[PDB]
Amino acid sequence: GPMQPRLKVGAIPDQNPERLNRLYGQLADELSDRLNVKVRYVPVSNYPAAVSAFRTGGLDLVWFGGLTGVQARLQTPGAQVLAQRDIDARFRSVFIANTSSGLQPISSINGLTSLRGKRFSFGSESSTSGRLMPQHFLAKAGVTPSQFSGGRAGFSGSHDATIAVVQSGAYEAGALNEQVWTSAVNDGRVNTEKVSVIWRTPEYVDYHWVVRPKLDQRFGKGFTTRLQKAILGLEPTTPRQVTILELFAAKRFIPVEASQYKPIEKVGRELGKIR
Ligand SMILES: [Cl-]
Ligand SMILES: [Cl-]
Ligand SMILES: [Cl-]
Ligand SMILES: [Cl-]
Ligand SMILES: [Cl-]
Ligand SMILES: [Cl-]
Ligand SMILES: [Cl-]
Ligand SMILES: [Cl-]
Ligand SMILES: [Cl-]
């Protein structure tokens, strides 16, 4: 192009878009200052749109969940995994219940049978922490979504929306991203009288940065490495970096290898999300 190259950063829309606009707009400015290239945050309206925009080149660098990042990489030969938060290596879901539902804390996976007959909400259909891994753990206890009230699960579309519909009593129970839950409790965004945690899943890997191939052709030899180092270099030294790391609820970003997503890919194929 006679136009100078711009890096398009995206993220799955996993929470309130106002909070994501603040986070990714601050991050785009931080990456822009560290790389000396124009960086823009481009929002998408749902999880699949992030996969699709990445596959077709509408996004260059995307904050994906486990399932969406595995999908994006399988459909985009040469895409690479750059980084994840410290917390993404040992991620969990919380199962939450409205305190009028009569659900008690569960002490084992086998106790998930208590959710039979209950109005249950997942997050996005494509969510690792909000759908895929919760559905996986439910299946191990012998619970399938057909056994919920109405013969199916709700899909709220986001971790924030799962808290909202359980808190409101529209659903009795749901599952979501533990970091979003913990940040919501700490911020006063959830009424802990109305909503409580009844179970935490075992650990799995979840969020990661995925980058399109051939960025070095657009931005120059070494750019992809410099981009990775910029993410890995984020540190709570300036107000802007403190804000980014606060909103990610991370102390740092760390390297990650594609091979650590093999278990997520397997669950995705078992539950029919990956063809
Ligand atoms: Cl460009
Ligand atoms: Cl552009
Ligand atoms: Cl795929
Ligand atoms: Cl689905
Ligand atoms: Cl089912
Ligand atoms: Cl369902
Ligand atoms: Cl439903
Ligand atoms: Cl290249
Ligand atoms: Cl840097």
Residue numbers in the entry: -2 to 272
Give the original sentences from the paper that presented this experimental model:
Here, the current status of the fully automated ambient-temperature beamline VMXi at Diamond Light Source is described, and a highly efficient pipeline from protein sample to final multi-crystal data analysis and structure determination is shown. Here we present illustrative examples of data measured using VMXi from a variety of proteins comprising both conventional crystallographic standards and ‘real world’ user samples. Routine RT data collection provides a useful capability that is highly relevant to studying protein dynamics and ligand binding without the complication of cryo-cooling.
As an example, here we show a project that focused on a range of nutrient-uptake proteins isolated from a marine cyano­bacteria (Synechococcus MITS9220). The availability of the two structures in complex with phosphate provided an opportunity to directly compare the ligand binding site and understand if temperature bias potentially led to any differences in the ligand-binding interactions. Thus, no temperature bias was introduced at the global or local scale for the MITS9220_PhnD1 protein.
